[PDB]
Design a protein around this ligand. Sequence first.
Ligand SMILES: Nc1nc2c(ncn2[C@@H]2O[C@H](COP(=O)(O)O)[C@@H](O)[C@H]2O)c(=O)[nH]1
Ligand SMILES: Nc1nc2c(ncn2[C@@H]2O[C@H](COP(=O)(O)O)[C@@H](O)[C@H]2O)c(=O)[nH]1
Lengths: 115, 115
Amino acid sequence: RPGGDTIFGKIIRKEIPAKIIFEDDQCLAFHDISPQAPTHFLVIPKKHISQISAAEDADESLLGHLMIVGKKCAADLGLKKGYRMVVNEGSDGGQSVYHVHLHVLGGRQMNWPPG
Amino acid sequence: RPGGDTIFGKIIRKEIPAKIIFEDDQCLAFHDISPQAPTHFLVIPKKHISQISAAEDADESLLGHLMIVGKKCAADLGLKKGYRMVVNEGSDGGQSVYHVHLHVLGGRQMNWPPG
Ligand SMILES: Nc1nc2c(ncn2[C@@H]2O[C@H](COP(=O)(O)O)[C@@H](O)[C@H]2O)c(=O)[nH]1
Ligand SMILES: Nc1nc2c(ncn2[C@@H]2O[C@H](COP(=O)(O)O)[C@@H](O)[C@H]2O)c(=O)[nH]1
């Protein structure tokens, strides 16, 4: 559209508000509307990739970029005792938004199994 | 050493056995010794990076490569109803091995919060 037709596309295009933490030419990081920990944000690419199973070999750097941006935002938000990054794929993974996104949660002890 | 001084380095060097699923010039994927789901494997880089907070901007492609390899292995292992990818960082994240690794779990419904 550009950005995609999900709500994430609307956020990228600034059509609906979000608490934006950081943004560059490739991605955007913003807080989750339903935090599962004291700090819970998402890092999403500006390029619409619907699922991680649909990402191409060429999307490799982009995907790695979401993680580098995720670690920089986490440190800047003070998650110095650690955090957990999560990517959900499909029904079994619990994915609800069909635009690839990385979850970053911290501020409390994360338990195991990870769901 | 090369591979690092953790058990992951020993696995990479074939000094101790693991159920290896796939291997290329950059990484290795093998089954977790303590599965938290029917299918639970790890994708680790051959380059030792101790923590995701320690990864450099140059490790971006490598990190994205762990995810691409993770999705290809998941599909090859039949996780067609989906899966969840997880990266744990530090104490709060629950990290126990100081060699960056990506968890891929599937074969059952993954719940929320992710720990
Ligand atoms: N900031 C923000 N987060 C949203 C919105 N709609 C959905 N989310 C969050 O997006 C996440 C998508 O993750 P999923 O469930 O696909 O793994 C959920 O945690 C959900 O709370 C929204 O309008 N704004
Ligand atoms: N295949 C294999 N998995 C291991 C071994 N030692 C530790 N692990 C697994 O490595 C994972 C490390 O994840 P962490 O707890 O750091 O997030 C754990 O799930 C643990 O069960 C081993 O000797 N072989």
